[PDB]
Amino acid sequence: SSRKELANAIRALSMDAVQKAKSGHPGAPMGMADIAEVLWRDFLKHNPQNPSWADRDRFVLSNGHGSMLIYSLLHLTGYDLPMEELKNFRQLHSKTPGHPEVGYTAGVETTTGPLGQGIANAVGMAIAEKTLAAQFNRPGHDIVDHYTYAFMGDGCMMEGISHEVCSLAGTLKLGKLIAFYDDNGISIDGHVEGWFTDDTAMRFEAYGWHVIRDIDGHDAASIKRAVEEARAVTDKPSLLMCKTIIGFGSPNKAGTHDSHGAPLGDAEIALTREQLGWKYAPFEIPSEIYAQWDAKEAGQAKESAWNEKFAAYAKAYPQEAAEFTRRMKGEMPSDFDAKAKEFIAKLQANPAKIASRKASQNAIEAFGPLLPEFLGGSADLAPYNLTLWSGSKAINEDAAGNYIHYGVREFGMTAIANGISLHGGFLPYTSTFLMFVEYARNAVRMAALMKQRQVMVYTHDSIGLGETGPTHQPVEQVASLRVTPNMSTWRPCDQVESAVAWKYGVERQDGPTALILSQQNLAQQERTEEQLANIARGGYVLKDCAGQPELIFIATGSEVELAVAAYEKLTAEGVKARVVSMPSTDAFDKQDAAYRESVLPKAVTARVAVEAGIADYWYKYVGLNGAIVGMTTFGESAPAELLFEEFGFTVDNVVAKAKELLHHHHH
Amino acid sequence: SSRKELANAIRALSMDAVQKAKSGHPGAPMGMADIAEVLWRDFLKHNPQNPSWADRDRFVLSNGHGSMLIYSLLHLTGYDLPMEELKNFRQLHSKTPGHPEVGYTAGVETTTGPLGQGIANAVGMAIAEKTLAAQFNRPGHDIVDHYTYAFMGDGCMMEGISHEVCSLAGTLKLGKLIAFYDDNGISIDGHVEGWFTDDTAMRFEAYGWHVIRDIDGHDAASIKRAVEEARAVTDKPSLLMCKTIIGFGSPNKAGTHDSHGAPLGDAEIALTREQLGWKYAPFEIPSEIYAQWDAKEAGQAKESAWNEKFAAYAKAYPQEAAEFTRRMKGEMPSDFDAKAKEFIAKLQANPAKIASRKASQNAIEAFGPLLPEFLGGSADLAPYNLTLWSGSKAINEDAAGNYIHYGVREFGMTAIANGISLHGGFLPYTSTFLMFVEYARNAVRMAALMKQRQVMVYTHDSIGLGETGPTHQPVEQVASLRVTPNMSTWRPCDQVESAVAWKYGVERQDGPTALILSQQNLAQQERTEEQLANIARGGYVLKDCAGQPELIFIATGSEVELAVAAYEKLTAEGVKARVVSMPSTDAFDKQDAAYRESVLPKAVTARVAVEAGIADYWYKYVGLNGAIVGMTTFGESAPAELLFEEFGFTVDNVVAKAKELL
Ligand SMILES: Cc1ncc(C[n+]2csc(CCOP(=O)(O)OP(=O)(O)O)c2C)c(N)n1
Ligand SMILES: Cc1ncc(C[n+]2csc(CCOP(=O)(O)OP(=O)(O)O)c2C)c(N)n1
Ligand SMILES: [Ca+2]
Ligand SMILES: [Ca+2]
């Protein structure tokens, strides 16, 4: 078989799988098949029999709608993705969902589809490789050495996140990142010149990339020469400008928007087979074509050689090797749990009224020596988010460091960190003011969807930040996080809940954790040993009465102090009241029914929520017969103490609103 | 007097107001003061006595933390912003909040602070000027002719949204957009070379901008020559690369991150006065410096000249001039309410089972001839969002058109449309798949904060979109919109509710409206005249019983049919059941309490919400003793019919959950 025939196997499988599903995207797989054949057969270092090989190259499909391209590649090269699964493309519980999903499918590195985020993930994978190589490689022992290859299209280039992450990739001189741009002139509205006219090569040169122009994306020799050129440039990420024809092979739909996102149709597929000279029936591949596509023997040889290298490394550097293995597996140090509990107990015994952003920094300082896998950063807010600890070292200064200055790039930061978590070897944390979670919002969602461990440090969480005013004062952002599937969100009320939340976040293996942290100092609360242990249950009884409470206050973060003051006033008047601290609604909801009943008993309807955030959220825990002391508006520019008074976060107002339930549930 | 003395008045007012507040940002106002002095005194066309003059130039401070720069300029040039307000910078209910806010302060064009969005707004204002000029100017009568000037810094340049909107500005050849980049080498983390190394001039030339490099931002002659050159380039937006020193004037904090975001301190202010040669006490400005800065006399002359031009236009083009005035004031045509009601009544009388995305297109088609102020578009999804009507004309093809191909740029699109609404003259609508409201989320928030009218057309709203799978299937996005202050969100259940929602959106005067639209066909519900009129109240009784209900279903959008099916089953068993359709929770919540009680009586606790979105939202209406048939997870890639079954959107499950309450 010629290279074109081998590439046409991808075209056939893609158009036929889309046709059988009556759904999906034939255009990009057909347009990029020749590029994929050269990259995967001539360059990609991988082992289909072990998709988790630590030193494999990473491939990312940023134009993720072209999912049949990667399913064809994985199937043809010998991964555990049988033809039956391709026949079940886009069907319930198949290993071939409409967009590729990490975990669903052997060999898929990331979940893509939302445009722009795949190239961001690839930038994170390349940062991870560079940093891990710098931390672990030793003279004569280069155990980390692999490339990151990405495909992307016009949509990814138009998205702002491409600017964020490719600018930063240029700064960091990511010489093992090689991206292929599917320059096919077509997007969904039609010919892109009506809305997309950038000199993209010049733009990427402005970022410090090595750009290869005018590659014939349907000519294997041209593509191969370009990839060799990119691999020879070791000090810059490379962009290959690949001129392709969307839907290549279809006489009537190639080069048209009609090939982008719908089945070609059976008549058109017959004509496409005739144009391509592809004789085989749908889902039929001859043994000779598998023989040229299969990567099991080469892959075995390469991983075997790497294992020999790693064994030599382990003999010369046994502690480093043990750390590499631990970190690539995502395992925690064996003594971490005990040391973290010792830290938390020390805080509970030694009160300090500090901002929870400072309590967060103190937890980073405490955990940092125990977690060399941290790869942390802030989006140009290190002095405000308090993300640096004494052991931080920026990777633009020393590549073996552990800290990233992300610049003013919140979305790019968060999707890069998704790439860092997907790579293995690190535990990323990211940070910005909470308001600007809105800039990064879909990357946060994607971390949750992909079940990735990442700690998101979001500071300056309410009107408590004061004079900066309503553009920066969060109101509804925490509610948005709380209703996100698989998101964990903590709003700690003091330095002890802050440390507990950080411990929870770094030990959470199957999804991300957002910390909602104050600008201003928070009072430490008294806790018994039992209460201290109950912080991690998300919601717990902090103050109580004998018998059934007449009133339960539910409070979070900076408002627990206010709720406790109201509880004290009411208790002194002879009212039976309880205070529940709710640092994490998601962790509380995961507790069993008996525990939740013990904290929020169904008999007690007179519930008062107190939080400087949007009020409507709290109907979930207060019901229709309680009260909510919350925000219902945007904030205002003024000193924070005047804002808390103006918006009702006062002991007198909280007590008055509570007493209306002693007056209403009565009358 | 001397231009440096005149610029130093901005420096003094800025450092002193920050010091008095013990809060704020002296650095960028001190760094950009010489640029501002040249722009405002020599070029900017404006009238302090009427900040709403239709043909004024628009100025945007995208690096909005530098708010004392714009307050100093407004005060010095004679706007209604007295010295007492500058002395009340960042104080409760002052006219000088920490970031500039449109409406709070005479002369402020937009609310900035979130980096990158000011330049986006300015691109929108320049698109509005270009389009309005093409629509209204006539030979001998150029009634629209003004510039859009923007200041921006490193943070705006790093943000992705700058790439989206400046790319599109190049495509649209916005020759009256002129941006000044405060190239001062400093951001909050320190010297920017550790994280920001772009050849920014080369980047902007890649967008098709005219770029002027190596301007000395502290030399009036350098700056003035650059502005003249940019104004002579009429077929490209221009970027002026202005080298400045942050905190210019401060001997110990100039050129450092220490001048970015905190008071300089009293000692350092004294040293700064010495270095600048500024001899005036805090909040002292001599009469001659006001005389040199004041723009009232020239401004009134220019606006009067324009009024005379407009009067001549109105004599030659009376209908066009009346349209111009109406649109610039943001008024609706006087017969729009009646014509839209006639359309809605027609739909109710002529049932159709269509997707609410199609019903949306049909409302655009009906309203299009009535609302020439539409300036609509989609982020590369016209064939899916259905944003084109028969009279759509793309502005990249015809500058006098009414449609924008925004490309794959959801955040930039939304903030550009905020600029369009701020400009006056237009009613923007934007569109993408609902999932990607998450890419644009803070610009949506900013439309609400700024009380701007924009209709946001979000289609493909649930697991009903099918095989595309969980990256695209919305679950929690509608709940996020619903709890945003001043946002209106509509999830119509058929073509009639879709038209009512569109009417509500275009008739809003003080905020945005999000339409949550289905991929798939939705059955039309039968309605009495009273029900039909009550759609606009956001929640209404769609199916009822005699007497107090025993069970109330609350449903939205594509799930109303499912709730009606469950109602029919329970009604046939003899249950006193009701179905409430809730297309807009915010419109419902604004109703009088007797109305809300008539729909959701407080004595009836057996309430079942049905919506293919996140369940947690609905506790607001069902409380603790009801049921919610909603989503609690991400979606899955499969045909939509199978997903609705898999996730419990079945008559059997809805009926079972209801019977658990009875
Ligand atoms: C952030 C985001 N916005 C919108 C979409 C919907 N969408 C999918 S592909 C596409 C444009 C297709 O353009 P391109 O990447 O050039 O596709 P191709 O040439 O591969 O078909 C759009 C708008 C998306 N997937 N992600
Ligand atoms: C989207 C967004 N992210 C973060 C911030 C916080 N912030 C305010 S100013 C700034 C950096 C200031 O850098 P630059 O624009 O270069 O400021 P300057 O030189 O004018 O002081 C940051 C990160 C913000 N306002 N908006
Ligand atoms: Ca394309
Ligand atoms: Ca700067």
Author numbering:
A (entry chain B): 2 to 668
B (entry chain A): 2 to 663
Relevant lines from the article:
Transketolase (TK) (EC 2.2.1.1) is a ubiquitous thiamine diphosphate (ThDP)-dependent enzyme linking the non-oxidative pentose phosphate pathway and the Calvin cycle. It catalyses the reversible transfer of a two-carbon moiety from a ketol donor to an aldehyde acceptor. Transketolase has been used to form asymmetric carbon-carbon bonds in biocatalytic organic synthesis, where the use of β-hydroxypyruvate (HPA) as the ketol donor renders the donor half-reaction irreversible. A different library design strategy was used at each stage to guide saturation mutagenesis, including the use of structural and phylogenetic information, statistical coupling analysis (SCA) methods to target networks for re-stabilisation, and substrate docking. In the latter stage, saturation mutagenesis of two TK active-site residues led to variants, including S385Y/D469T/R520Q, that were active on three benzaldehyde derivatives, in contrast to wild-type TK which was active only on non-aromatic aldehydes.
The crystal structure of S385Y/D469T/R520Q E. coli TK in the presence of its cofactors was determined to 1.50 Å resolution with very good statistics (Rwork: 12,58%, Rfree: 15,69%). The structural analysis of EcTK S385Y/D469T/R520Q could unambiguously confirm the introduced mutations. In fact, there was no evidence of any significant shifts in backbone, sidechain or cofactor structure compared to the wild-type protein. The aromatic side chain of introduced residue Y385 is accommodated almost coplanar 7–8 Å above the thiazolium ring of ThDP thus generating a snug π-π stacking binding pocket for aromatic substrates (sandwiched between Y385 and ThDP). The binding of aliphatic phospho-sugar substrates is clearly impeded as the Y385 side chain would clash with the substrate phosphate moiety, and the S385Y mutation also removes a hydrogen-bonding site to the S385 hydroxyl moiety, which is known to interact with phosphate groups in the natural substrates of TK28. In the triple variant, the side chain of Y385 is held in place through a network of H-bonding interactions involving 3 water molecules and residue G262. The D469T mutation removed a salt bridge to R91, and replaced it with a hydrogen bond from the T469 hydroxyl moiety. The mutation also created a small pocket in which the R91 guanidinium moiety is more solvent accessible within the enzyme active site, and also available for hydrogen bonding to potential substrates. The R520Q mutation created a wider opening to the active-site funnel, which may compensate for the decreased steric access for substrates, introduced by the S385Y mutation. Introduction of the S385Y mutation into D469T/R520Q to produce the triple-mutant creates an enclosed hydrophobic binding-pocket for all three benzaldehyde substrates.
